[PDB]
């Protein structure tokens, strides 16, 4: 099963983008 796993991977990358937004919010 790769289609369902790919859906989970897309969500994992989004979590990383959010962590980056919080880091930038603290710096600027």
From Swiss-Prot:
Localisation per UniProt entry: Host endoplasmic reticulum membrane
Membrane topology (UniProt): Multi-pass membrane protein
Modification after translation (UniProt): Palmitoylated. This modification may play a role in its polymerization or in protein-protein interactions.
Function noted in UniProt: Induces a specific membrane alteration that serves as a scaffold for the virus replication complex. This membrane alteration gives rise to the so-called ER-derived membranous web that contains the replication complex. NS4B self-interaction contributes to its function in membranous web formation. Promotes host TRIF protein degradation in a CASP8-dependent manner thereby inhibiting host TLR3-mediated interferon signaling. Disrupts the interaction between STING and TBK1 contributing to the inhibition of interferon signaling.
Subunit-structure text: Homomultimer. Interacts with non-structural protein NS5A. Interacts with host PLA2G4C; this interaction likely initiates the recruitment of replication complexes to lipid droplets. Interacts with host STING; this interaction disrupts the interaction between STING and TBK1 thereby suppressing the interferon signaling. Interacts with host METTL22; this interaction may promote the recruitment of NS4B in the proximity of lipid droplet. Part of the replication complex composed of NS2, NS3, NS4A, NS4B, NS5A and the RNA-directed RNA polymerase embedded in an ER-derived membranous web.
Free-text note regarding domains: Contains a glycine zipper region that critically contributes to the biogenesis of functional ER-derived replication organelles.
Protein name (database record): Non-structural protein 4B
Organism: Hepatitis C virus genotype 1a (isolate H77) (HCV)
UniProt lineage: Viruses, Riboviria, Orthornavirae, Kitrinoviricota, Flasuviricetes
Whole-protein coverage range: 1938 to 1965 of 3011
